[PDB]
Design a protein around this nucleic acid. Structure first.
Ligand SMILES: [K+]
Ligand SMILES: [K+]
Ligand SMILES: [K+]
Ligand SMILES: [K+]
Ligand SMILES: [K+]
Ligand SMILES: [K+]
Ligand SMILES: [K+]
Ligand SMILES: [K+]
Ligand SMILES: [K+]
Ligand SMILES: [K+]
Ligand SMILES: [K+]
Ligand SMILES: [K+]
Ligand SMILES: [K+]
Ligand SMILES: [K+]
Ligand SMILES: [K+]
Ligand SMILES: [Mg+2]
Ligand SMILES: [Mg+2]
Ligand SMILES: [Mg+2]
Ligand SMILES: [Mg+2]
Ligand SMILES: [Mg+2]
Ligand SMILES: [Mg+2]
Ligand SMILES: [Mg+2]
Ligand SMILES: [Mg+2]
Ligand SMILES: [Mg+2]
Ligand SMILES: [Mg+2]
Ligand SMILES: [Mg+2]
Ligand SMILES: [Mg+2]
Ligand SMILES: [Mg+2]
Ligand SMILES: [Mg+2]
Ligand SMILES: [Mg+2]
Ligand SMILES: [Mg+2]
Ligand SMILES: [Mg+2]
Ligand SMILES: [Mg+2]
Ligand SMILES: [Mg+2]
Ligand SMILES: [Mg+2]
Ligand SMILES: [Mg+2]
Ligand SMILES: [Mg+2]
Ligand SMILES: [Mg+2]
Ligand SMILES: [Mg+2]
Ligand SMILES: [Mg+2]
Ligand SMILES: [Mg+2]
Ligand SMILES: [Mg+2]
Ligand SMILES: [Mg+2]
Ligand SMILES: [Mg+2]
Ligand SMILES: [Mg+2]
Ligand SMILES: [Mg+2]
Ligand SMILES: [Mg+2]
Ligand SMILES: [Mg+2]
Ligand SMILES: [Mg+2]
Ligand SMILES: [Mg+2]
Ligand SMILES: [Mg+2]
Ligand SMILES: [Mg+2]
Ligand SMILES: [Mg+2]
Ligand SMILES: [Mg+2]
Ligand SMILES: [Mg+2]
Ligand SMILES: [Mg+2]
Ligand SMILES: [Mg+2]
Ligand SMILES: [Mg+2]
Ligand SMILES: [Mg+2]
Ligand SMILES: [Mg+2]
Ligand SMILES: [Mg+2]
Ligand SMILES: [Mg+2]
Ligand SMILES: [Mg+2]
Lengths: 102, 123, 154, 319
RNA sequence: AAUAUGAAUUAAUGCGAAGUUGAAAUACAGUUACCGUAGGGGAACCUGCGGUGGGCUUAUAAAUAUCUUAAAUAUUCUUACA
RNA sequence: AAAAAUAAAAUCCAUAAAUAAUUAAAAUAAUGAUAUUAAUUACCAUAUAUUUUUAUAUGGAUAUAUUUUAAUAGUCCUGACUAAUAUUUGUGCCAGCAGUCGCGGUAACACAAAGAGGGCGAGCGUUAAUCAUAAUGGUUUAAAGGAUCCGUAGAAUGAAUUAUAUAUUAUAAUUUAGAGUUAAUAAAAUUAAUUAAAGAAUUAUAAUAGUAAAGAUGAAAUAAAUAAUUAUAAGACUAAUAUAUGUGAAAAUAUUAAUUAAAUAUUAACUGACAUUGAGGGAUUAAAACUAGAGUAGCGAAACGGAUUCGAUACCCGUGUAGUUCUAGUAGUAAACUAUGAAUACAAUUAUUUAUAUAUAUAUAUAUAAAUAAUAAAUGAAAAUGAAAGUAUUCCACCUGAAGAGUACGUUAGCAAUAAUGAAACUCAAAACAAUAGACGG
RNA sequence: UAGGUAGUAGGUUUAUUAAGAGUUAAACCUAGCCAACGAUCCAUAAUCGAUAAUGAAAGUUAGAACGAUCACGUUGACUCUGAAAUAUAGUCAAUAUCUAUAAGAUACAGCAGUGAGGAAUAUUGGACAAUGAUCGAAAGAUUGAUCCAGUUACUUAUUAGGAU
């Protein structure tokens, strides 16, 4: 599956996702932050192309259910800026990106 | 719990390791006198003749200490130094005697891990 | 009433899950200001005054004779098989109200967790009440206002 | 799963066969002798393609992946030579196609496994003199010379400082033959800088990335509202990025805009000096509540982060 | 009077090995188990009274059916007829 | 691809120390404990040029050159967690190792060692300690909803509009959607307490004729009858309807009537937030039990007997005391269970009853609620929950590994049995739930 | 530890103090005051920081070292002087020791050091050169404050040989 990536490095905002007994709390990170997450989540992020991420797993830490929950979270719990803008009829500006633009 | 119940004391239990050497009184080690040397039988599924010793510490606490290493010269009235650490297969033996301290000599002919058995370096 | 606002936020979540195009909320000043902000921010398609039975087609003056039968009717938006208004939660709760100075509101919009409030996320709307007026947090920061952080909509 | 792994060559090599009992050799040692080739009576390895330095301004960086471990070539014709069954070196059966069309980037990449590390370009002895004569004699600004030759201002300022040292050394005959020989050898090992070549030119728009801005703030504004760099700067409470670039270009000692006078407002007194006194007192006006050593400050001497500095004489001193 | 110490004296309990007397529980466990309570018995346990299901929802037929043009007509039909 | 190993030696070049000269600074008017000062320089001094630095040349100084000159780390570990693949020897559930899981019974990667290897390093290990390492929690079934409701405090929470103020609060006025009051109209006959009645049967006694067995059980045996028809007495119980449907706070509540008390829906008018929840507290609370006085048919702990059995302090049978009943009290416990606290707002369907209302071409039809059943979504460890165990808000109770233990001690209460409150030590790395596939089932 | 309190809670007046007040003493009135958001009682503990440790952080821990505050100088009470002392003073008593045997002196929690206790913590060192403190008009005197050194891997840091 294709997963949305903000700047092809991280997720859009923060994610609090519940997959069966696994409570996933994932936070987006600044460029160069690296992957600071559960080891199962780390491997998935490497394959998916996520470079910067922070997170913590609560309740169940079953490897199998963390991996599936993570995949589900990356698809069902994210919304691109473009999708948010079109749905609300509003312009969303990345302030950090504009600051370094012409 | 509700917000008022938390205000009244409700909260997560704290996680902090508990003392497993209460008889030492929060000291690294305590001197003692061997009351009686004994041989004990491990709990199953282990089988051995584990050498232990009953010791009266300088604070009046009497404990059972495991004598590590192959062979020991500990007797009654021998001055021993006791440290923390239980013998897993021997129930009730929660302490260790230090080899090479007091009247307990270092393990004879010990080559590896000498510092753990009071053995000096061979020239 | 913050309780009424909590009821409305939960109601909108329930309606979004079933994908009803039109629903009603209690007729009060706070509810009207709350709905109006959502409408201007693009979370609601429509906002009409009405009765218990439906939105009014022609203007109906509200008086004590019919105040008990008044309702506000809001249209929910759905695009690409997803609800536009997915979640709606209070920050300031009835049993724990949160008043922040403008300095702390700027930290909240900058990624800093203030008083356990998770910071503003991309595309999220946080509303603040100041002197009985409801506005977006970014607008309160522009006006140098201190106010109660009411709710967050995403 | 992990285990100790002897670092055998990734490429194929001739392993040891049955060995006479007193050789006591290793497969690593024999693989190295195959990489090095024969050692002559002078202690040299003439058959190895890396023994001698390049003299054509093209670095000779190792390419084991492209040559599959074949590091031997004829010392004069530079023609590949490989080990044969006889134990002699001879032409390879098939030419290596991976070694004839090498990308330009790879030629400047010294380490096979890191393509983000590249060598820098050496400046010719002429461009340095031109830069030296323009900043010092013609009186051009470092910003002008930087924008002209495509060099970062700090590098421009460094060239002037170094050329001044080379004049004093040449004015006192301190540059010996060995130094001249070494300098020329090293000059012919690196790609020369070409101010005209656009790709060789250094980027001149780089600014340090602050930390407050490193976060990602997003604003929801009207669909047709214009939002530009200046508006973003106000949101982030920082000077515009273009202003930061301009202020960083006026830092060079020979650059335009260099100014330092707002600090000349601190009353100083130089005590009277009398015959026989070995030192002079200098008094600097300060303010109560700021001046002085604080009481009860953290002692770090017994901590890993103990502060260590260096005085004017270069001696290590505890701060 | 309190606190601490030792204490004649005396109560409860854990673990360890390890047999003994029975066979109480888990299946309808061979008398449904368990809860409260009372009495009795080497020991588990037995018995009375009410309660619970964490046991019986595990639940599955006394059967009986009808008339309009069977075709030179429906069944065929390929953008046609109208 | 089994290495040890560029490791060693050897070669080149250094610096430290030593030696020599020199010599700050802490302090100056002078005074230096530290002190055999730091640092610098390598024959010393001087001049010139000379970022630094370098270089030349000079005065004195030794025989064209100019003091000498190095480099011996320990400690833990290599089965997994946890970095350590090059193998080998001894031991044989012994000796011993062990933070956790565990290792050792003749091929031990774990014990004791050799080889090789991995950490940290003038330290390494170990013990004793501190911080961090999951509540961005839970209580039907795993620890955990209080038996139930009433209601006090709450420094708990809680409607609408407008105007002020010093502002999520206060005050004032105003409002009626929450919560109440009174009527009207319709509906229902239940739930408490009390009083007055009825019914089938049972046991006993007597009579009558009529007999010789009757009764019991798996089979048995223990203790003028049994059966039949009459008459009399006594206590307890309440067949069908019946679904505990419904009603009641829970416990409870179904033979009849009466008295008293409480309870439904809609409409009209009225009050104008008077509400929710509820620590402490209060009240009620099955069965058993206890204190008095009555009653005592049947049933029935115990006890004494009969059987069964290898035994039978049992299951079955007999005789059957307390108790079961009533009156007045004590006590406040149950698997007191929906193993699921109360309130409010809200979310997709169907079926079936019930209620109120509406209509008519009068018996259905159309509406709006309640209940129950099956579900969507959602939630969940799942089994499942389903208008909550969903989405939310408010308040209370409760839980924090097993065992020890709902025990010990103390205290309070009670006539008493007991009830409430309620630990710690020691020991262990367990312990528990849902579900899966089997095996087994008198 | 569930009831506690009896100058206890409040009022009035005098005494005392530079000064308020049941702060102490005296008199007379009122019946209060505290407490299940924990009184009273018991146990334990010097407190804290722009200090140290740890953590992403809220926090948690320590309270040696640096600094701030309090208390104490073998134990108890009292008095004198004084702006201020229940003073490391004085008085009396207690405990211990000592010699001069007196209504005596001493009390190392000042420095060094010793015995004891403990798993465990150092020299009976040098100097008043520096910074301070006391006395003196000054010259100067004194200073175990302080500055230095010694002992100890207790902590930190640098170095502990490079090319071939
Ligand atoms: K049984
Ligand atoms: K029972
Ligand atoms: K029973
Ligand atoms: K090593
Ligand atoms: K549950
Ligand atoms: K019922
Ligand atoms: K009002
Ligand atoms: K209330
Ligand atoms: K209560
Ligand atoms: K009876
Ligand atoms: K039940
Ligand atoms: K409750
Ligand atoms: K207390
Ligand atoms: K100390
Ligand atoms: K001095
Ligand atoms: Mg490994
Ligand atoms: Mg049996
Ligand atoms: Mg049985
Ligand atoms: Mg049974
Ligand atoms: Mg019995
Ligand atoms: Mg029973
Ligand atoms: Mg069963
Ligand atoms: Mg069942
Ligand atoms: Mg030297
Ligand atoms: Mg001097
Ligand atoms: Mg070992
Ligand atoms: Mg072997
Ligand atoms: Mg190991
Ligand atoms: Mg070993
Ligand atoms: Mg070895
Ligand atoms: Mg070190
Ligand atoms: Mg935490
Ligand atoms: Mg609950
Ligand atoms: Mg209940
Ligand atoms: Mg319960
Ligand atoms: Mg009403
Ligand atoms: Mg008869
Ligand atoms: Mg009946
Ligand atoms: Mg019912
Ligand atoms: Mg209540
Ligand atoms: Mg009686
Ligand atoms: Mg019987
Ligand atoms: Mg009662
Ligand atoms: Mg009980
Ligand atoms: Mg109970
Ligand atoms: Mg019941
Ligand atoms: Mg109610
Ligand atoms: Mg009890
Ligand atoms: Mg189960
Ligand atoms: Mg007074
Ligand atoms: Mg007083
Ligand atoms: Mg008085
Ligand atoms: Mg103390
Ligand atoms: Mg603290
Ligand atoms: Mg403290
Ligand atoms: Mg100290
Ligand atoms: Mg004192
Ligand atoms: Mg004193
Ligand atoms: Mg005194
Ligand atoms: Mg003393
Ligand atoms: Mg001393
Ligand atoms: Mg000692
Ligand atoms: Mg001295």
């Amino acid at each position: 599956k294709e997963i949305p990536r903000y700047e092809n490095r991280t997720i859009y905002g923060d994610i609090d996702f519940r997959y069966h007994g696994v409570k996933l709390h994932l936070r987006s990170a600044k460029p160069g932050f690296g992957l600071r997450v559960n080891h199962v989540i780390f491997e998935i992020c490497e394959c998916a192309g996520i470079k910067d991420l922070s997170g913590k797993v609560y309740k169940s830490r079953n490897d199998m259910n963390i991996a599936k929950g993570t995949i589900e979270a990356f698809t069902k719990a994210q919304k691109t800026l473009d999708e948010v803008a079109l749905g609300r009829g509003k312009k969303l500006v990345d302030v950090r990106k504009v600051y370094y633009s012409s | 719990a509700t917000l008022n119940q938390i205000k009244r004391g409700s909260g997560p239990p704290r996680r902090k390791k508990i003392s497993t050497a209460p008889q030492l009184d929060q000291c690294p080690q305590r001197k003692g006198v061997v009351l009686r040397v004994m041989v004990l039988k491990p709990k199953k599924p282990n089988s051995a003749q584990r050498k232990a010793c009953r010791v009266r510490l300088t604070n009046g606490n009497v404990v059972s200490a495991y004598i590590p290493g192959e062979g020991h010269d500990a007797q009654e009235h021998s001055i021993v130094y006791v440290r923390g650490g239980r013998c897993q297969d021997l129930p009730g033996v929660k302490y260790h005697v230090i080899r090479g301290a007091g009247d307990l000599s270092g393990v004879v002919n010990r080559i590896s891990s000498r510092s753990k058995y009071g053995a000096k370096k061979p020239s | 009433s913050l309780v009424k606002l909590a009821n409305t936020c939960a109601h909108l979540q329930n309606c979004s899950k079933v994908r009803v195009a039109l629903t009603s909320i209690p007729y009060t000043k706070l509810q009207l200001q709350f709905a109006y902000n959502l409408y201007q921010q693009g979370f609601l398609s429509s906002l009409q005054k009405g009765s218990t039975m439906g939105p009014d087609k022609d203007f109906v003056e509200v008086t004590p004779d019919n105040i008990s039968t008044r309702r506000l009717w809001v249209g929910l938006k759905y695009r690409d098989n997803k609800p536009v208004l997915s979640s709606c939660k209070l920050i300031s709760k009835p049993n724990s109200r949160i008043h922040l100075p403008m300095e702390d509101m700027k930290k909240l919009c900058s990624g800093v967790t203030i008083r356990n409030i998770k910071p503003l996320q991309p595309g999220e709307l946080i509303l603040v009440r100041a002197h009985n007026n409801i506005m977006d947090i970014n607008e309160a920061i522009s006006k140098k206002l201190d106010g109660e952080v009411l709710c967050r909509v995403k | 799963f992990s285990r100790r792994r002897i670092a055998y060559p990734f490429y194929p090599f001739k392993k040891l066969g049955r060995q006479h009992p007193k050789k006591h050799d290793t497969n690593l040692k024999t693989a190295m002798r195959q990489f090095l080739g024969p050692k002559n009576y002078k202690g040299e390895y003439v058959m190895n393609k890396y023994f001698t330095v390049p003299t054509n301004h093209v670095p000779n960086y190792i390419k084991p992946d492209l040559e599959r471990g074949q590091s031997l070539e004829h010392p004069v014709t530079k023609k590949p030579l490989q080990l044969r069954y006889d134990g002699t070196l001879g032409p390879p059966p098939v030419e290596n196609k991976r070694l004839q069309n090498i990308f330009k980037d790879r030629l400047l990449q010294p380490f096979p496994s890191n393509p983000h590390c590249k060598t820098n370009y050496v400046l010719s002895p002429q461009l340095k003199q031109s830069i030296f004569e323009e900043i010092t004699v013609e009186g051009l600004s470092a910003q002008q010379v930087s924008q002209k030759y495509g060099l970062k201002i700090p590098r421009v300022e460094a060239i002037v400082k170094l050329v001044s040292v080379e004049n004093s050394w040449n004015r006192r005959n301190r540059v010996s033959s060995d130094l001249k020989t070494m300098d020329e050898t090293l000059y012919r090992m690196f790609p020369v800088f070409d101010s005209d070549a656009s790709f060789k030119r250094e980027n001149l728009s780089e600014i340090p990335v602050p930390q407050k801005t490193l976060a990602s703030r997003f604003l929801t504004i009207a669909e047709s509202e214009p939002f530009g760099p200046v508006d973003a700067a106000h949101v982030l409470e920082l000077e515009p990025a273009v202003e930061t670039l301009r202020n960083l270009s006026t830092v060079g000692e020979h650059s335009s805009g260099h100014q330092q006078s707002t600090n000349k407002n601190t009353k100083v007194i130089y005590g009277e000096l009398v015959e026989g006194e070995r030192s002079q007192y200098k008094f600097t006006n300060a303010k109560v509540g700021k001046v002085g050593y604080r009481y009860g400050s953290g002692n770090r001497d017994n901590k890993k982060d103990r502060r260590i500095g260096f005085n004017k004489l270069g001696q290590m001193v505890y701060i």
